[PDB]
Amino acid sequence: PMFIVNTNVPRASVPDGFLSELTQQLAQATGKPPQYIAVHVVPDQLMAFGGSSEPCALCSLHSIGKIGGAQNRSYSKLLCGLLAERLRISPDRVYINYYDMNAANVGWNNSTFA
Amino acid sequence: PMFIVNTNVPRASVPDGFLSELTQQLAQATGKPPQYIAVHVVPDQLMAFGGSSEPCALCSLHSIGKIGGAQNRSYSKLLCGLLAERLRISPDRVYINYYDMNAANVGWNNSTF
Amino acid sequence: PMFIVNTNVPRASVPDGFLSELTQQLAQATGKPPQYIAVHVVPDQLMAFGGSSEPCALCSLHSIGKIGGAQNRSYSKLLCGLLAERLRISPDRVYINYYDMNAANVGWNNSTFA
């Protein structure tokens, strides 16, 4: 599972430890070992949401399985909460795209996960 | 709907109100209110198109529905037109990936659609 | 075909010619003229892989066709190979998401490829 956050919050507003927190929390939420989890945060972005440049985020969570109606609702509560607490972004200014990847469509270690 | 542009055009070349035009231009085409449109522009990128570092863009438009053959054609003419007009990028140096998102696969405001 | 690499390796560590090498190698690997190939490298990223900030990459390869189990394994060997050789990223610290795009879902030159 791979989590990417793109935001207009500045770099200095991203707390030390945020990447590890995401890692740990996603390992709890996906039930995957943290060794398999990748996280990526992109601050200082030129973005708008509803026409406004107030703090906002555009995110993606890719996983091989563990994607679904209820699961995605749970992930959205978790990740919006983290973005709200740590980056001071309102949950109604976050979008998170979920992608259920086929194992054959994820490369790693000179091959794929098929 | 969410539109993302990545481009090698420099930041200084992105004019005032660019994000704002995108958002308005986009509300119209999709049948969505501006309130909900998200836009993202990423200048100063290290990219090539056709092996050339002349101005170019790689973009994504995500929507829950309102994606299809004719619609994507129309969006393409719209967005290529703006990128050409505002960022001086030739239309034949732009790629736009369209994604029809399932509502259950879009999160927002602690839940999904 | 479109290849994107997001990495925490710094800009100065991306060697001269890398965008051209990627373009050339993907032309050979996909069977597609170089004029159709787009490449994008994003250094200096705030990333973690497996709860570590050692060099890593998160990548995507989009193609209209030319995507599948054996092809993707081949692409992963090639692309991890380049990332290890040129950017000193270990292949087990790379993910590559593969996307088989429908022609009607790729815009270009005021229209789509459909």
Numbering used by the authors:
A (entry chain A), C (entry chain C): 1 to 114
B (entry chain B): 1 to 113
Give verbatim lines from the article.
Macrophage migration inhibitory factor (MIF) is expressed at high levels in various inflammatory diseases and cancer. Macrophage migration inhibitory factor promotes directional cell migration (or chemotaxis) of various cell types 2, 3, 4.
To structurally verify the proposal for the inhibition of p110γ and p101 expression, we co‐crystallized 1, 2 and 12 with MIF. 1 occupies the bottom half of the catalytic pocket, whereas 2 occupies the upper half. The solvent‐exposed ring structures of 2 and 12 point towards different directions. In fact, the solvent‐exposed ring structure of ISO‐1 and 2 are well overlaid. The phenol ring of Tyr36 was moved from the original position (magenta) as shown in 1‐bound structure to a slightly open position (green) in 2‐bound structure, and to the fully open position (light pink) in 12‐bound structure. In contrast, MIF:ISO‐1, MIF:1 and MIF:2 show relatively increased B‐factors (>10 Å2, >30 Å2, and >25 Å2 respectively) for the L2 loop. As MIF:1, MIF:2 and MIF:ISO‐1 inhibited MIF‐induced leucocyte migration and increased B‐factors in L2, it is likely that structural stability of L2 is the critical structural determinant for the chemoattractant activity of MIF. The displacements are 1.1 Å for 1, 0.6 Å for 4‐IPP, 0.6 Å for 2 and 0.5 Å for ISO‐1 and 0.2 Å for 12.
